[PDB]
């Protein structure tokens, strides 16, 4: 459903990780399957060879928290104009205070011990509903 | 540039912003709107140092690097009670519990 | 204009109405003071810092900084955020 187009038209791209997280680039292949690419350290950039109509999304490499590329969720390389690369700015979204708290707590508690926490049962499942690329993919689809 | 502050007296905390070029007196005017006390009855502090009305917040060390939205800088407030100024007091926030073993 | 959010231990937090109106739960509670019988002040101060943070960075292509949460306040902040849905 959400797939890259096989345009075969090359597009030159710079992924700039403007977030404090290790960024995992994900290419959506022609069958819709997410394909991971080498990780991008915080404050670093990489020149990428992609194609017009291709689909990329970005995540925290360790936690798979969702990140933003050009203020949106999906980056589709476009036509290079004047032979300049298209810039893909990876940034942190403004998480909810709930999402941000789930992030930190997930980082401090191993999942087997989530239930040892003295919180409402609704939160037990929210901790276990860790962000996932496939879950996010279905939502956009 | 906007500086992001917590104005604190006793058990009261104001969250507001101001321009780095703003003056201490203009911040007393801001407090006057909220807490209904005139600048003549207010003393503003950085840590333990009284701030002069004419100096800008940047000159007093409240800067964009220092006074940030997610980590605002603290300005102490002391009030005058009919001709006499109280000592600067800021009640601390509550203490967090010890970390659960699960962490 | 401002509103006053009072913590369980009696600290009064004065924030801008638009900042507090970000939360729908707080909006409901207001309809100019709200009392939180379960949220201590070390939690509620961070709640207000988040208001400042959210309103500032919501629509900016400038790099957004992380909202920092000390490990010691993580659990309590989470409960409060779940209750206020924010």
Swiss-Prot record, chain A:
Distribution of this protein across tissues and organs: Expressed in the adult and fetal brain and kidney.
Q: What is the effect of changing residue 50 to N?
A: In VHLD; type I
Q: What is the effect of changing residue 19 to N?
A: In PCC and VHLD; type I
Tell me what effect the entry lists for residue 43 to A.
Answer: In cerebellar hemangioblastoma
Superkingdom of origin: Eukaryota
Q: What is the effect of changing residue 123 to R?
A: In VHLD; type I
| Outcome reported for the amino acid change (mutating residue 35 to P) | In VHLD; type I
- Record annotation: effect of changing residue 17 to H: In VHLD; type I
Q: Reported effect of changing residue 50 to C?
A: In VHLD; type II
Q: What is the effect of changing residue 100 to G?
A: In VHLD; type II
What result follows from mutating residue 75 to C? In PCC and VHLD; type II
Q: What is known to happen upon mutating residue 15 to L?
A: In VHLD; type I
What result follows from mutating residue 32 to C? In PCC and VHLD; type II
Per the UniProt entry, the effect of residue 93 to L is: In VHLD; type II
Name the consequence of residue 125 to K.
Answer: In VHLD; type I
Impact after mutating residue 4 to W: In VHLD; type I
- Any one GO MF annotation of this record: DNA-binding transcription factor binding
Q: What is the effect of changing residue 117 to Q?
A: In VHLD; type II
Q: What is the effect of changing residue 54 to R?
A: In VHLD; type II
S-S bonds: none
The UniProt comment on domains reads:
The Elongin BC complex binding domain is also known as BC-box with the consensus [APST]-L-x(3)-C-x(3)-[AILV].
Name the family the entry cites. Belongs to the VHL family.
For this entry, the protein name equals von Hippel-Lindau disease tumor suppressor
Name of the gene this protein is made from: VHL
Query: Which part of the entire protein is covered?
Result: 62 to 202 of 213
UniProtKB/Swiss-Prot annotation, chain B:
Record the organism.
Homo sapiens (Human)
Q: What is its main location?
A: nucleus
Q: What is this protein called?
A: Elongin-B
Q: Tell me where it resides.
A: Nucleus
- Describe the function of this protein: SIII, also known as elongin, is a general transcription elongation factor that increases the RNA polymerase II transcription elongation past template-encoded arresting sites. Subunit A is transcriptionally active and its transcription activity is strongly enhanced by binding to the dimeric complex of the SIII regulatory subunits B and C (elongin BC complex). Core component of multiple cullin-2 and cullin-5-RING E3 ubiquitin-protein ligase complexes (ECS complexes), which mediate the ubiquitination of target proteins. By binding to BC-box motifs it seems to link target recruitment subunits, like VHL and members of the SOCS box family, to Cullin/RBX1 modules that activate E2 ubiquitination enzymes. Component the von Hippel-Lindau ubiquitination complex CBC(VHL).
Superkingdom assignment: Eukaryota
Transcription regulation listed as a keyword: yes
- Gene that encodes it: ELOB
Domain Ubiquitin-like: residue ranges: 1-66
* PTM sites of type N-acetylmethionine: 1
Output the Gene Ontology cellular-component terms: Cul2-RING ubiquitin ligase complex; Cul5-RING ubiquitin ligase complex; cytosol; elongin complex; nucleoplasm; VCB complex
Q: How is this protein organized at the quaternary level?
A: Heterotrimer of an A (ELOA, ELOA2 or ELOA3P), ELOB and ELOC subunit. The elongin BC complex interacts with EPOP; leading to recruit the elongin BC complex to Polycomb group (PcG) target genes, thereby restricting excessive activity of the PRC2/EED-EZH2 complex.
Curated annotation (Swiss-Prot), chain C:
Tissues expressing this chain: Overexpressed in prostate cancer cell line PC-3 and breast cancer cell line SK-BR-3.
Subcellular location, principal: nucleus
Summarize the PTM comment: Ubiquitinated by the DCX(AMBRA1) complex, leading to its degradation by the proteasome.
**Disulfide cross-links:** none
**Cellular component per GO, a single term:** Cul2-RING ubiquitin ligase complex
- Domain of life, per UniProt, equals Eukaryota
Query: What job does this protein perform?
Result: SIII, also known as elongin, is a general transcription elongation factor that increases the RNA polymerase II transcription elongation past template-encoded arresting sites. Subunit A is transcriptionally active and its transcription activity is strongly enhanced by binding to the dimeric complex of the SIII regulatory subunits B and C (elongin BC complex).
- Protein's name according to its UniProt entry: Elongin-C
The organism's taxonomy opens as: Eukaryota, Metazoa, Chordata, Craniata, Vertebrata
């Amino acid at each position: 459903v959400l797939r890259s187009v096989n345009s075969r038209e090359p597009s030159q791209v710079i992924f700039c990780n403007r977030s404090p997280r290790v960024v995992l680039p994900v290419w959506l292949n022609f069958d819709g399957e997410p394909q991971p690419y080498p990780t991008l350290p915080p404050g670093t950039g990489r020149r990428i060879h992609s194609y017009r109509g291709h689909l990329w999304l970005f995540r925290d490499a360790g936690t798979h928290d969702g990140l933003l590329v050009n203020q949106t969720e999906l980056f589709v390389p476009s036509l290079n104009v004047d032979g300049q690369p298209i810039f893909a700015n990876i940034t942190l979204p403004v998480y909810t205070l709930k999402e941000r708290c789930l992030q930190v707590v997930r980082s401090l508690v191993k999942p087997e011990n989530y239930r040892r926490l003295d919180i409402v049962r609704s939160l037990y499942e929210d901790l276990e509903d860790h962000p996932n690329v496939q879950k996010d993919l279905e939502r956009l689809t | 540039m906007d500086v992001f502050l917590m104005i604190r007296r006793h058990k009261t905390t104001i969250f507001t912003d101001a321009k780095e070029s703003s003056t201490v007196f203009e911040l007393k005017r801001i407090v006057e709107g909220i807490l209904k006390r005139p600048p003549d009855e207010q003393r503003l502090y950085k840590d333990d140092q009284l701030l002069d009305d004419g100096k800008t917040l940047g000159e007093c060390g409240f800067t964009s690097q220092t006074a940030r939205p997610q980590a605002p800088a603290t300005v102490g407030l002391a009030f005058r009670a009919d001709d006499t100024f109280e000592a600067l007091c800021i009640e601390p926030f509550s203490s967090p519990p010890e970390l659960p073993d699960v962490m | 204009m401002y509103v006053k959010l009072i913590s369980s231990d009696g600290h009064e937090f004065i924030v801008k109405r638009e900042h507090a109106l970000t939360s729908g739960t707080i909006k409901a509670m207001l309809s100019n003071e709200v009392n939180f019988r379960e949220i201590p002040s070390h939690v509620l101060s961070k709640v207000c810092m988040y208001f400042t943070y959210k309103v500032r960075y919501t629509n900016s292509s400038t790099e957004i900084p992380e909202f920092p949460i000390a490990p010691e306040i993580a659990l309590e902040l989470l409960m409060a955020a779940n209750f206020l849905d924010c």
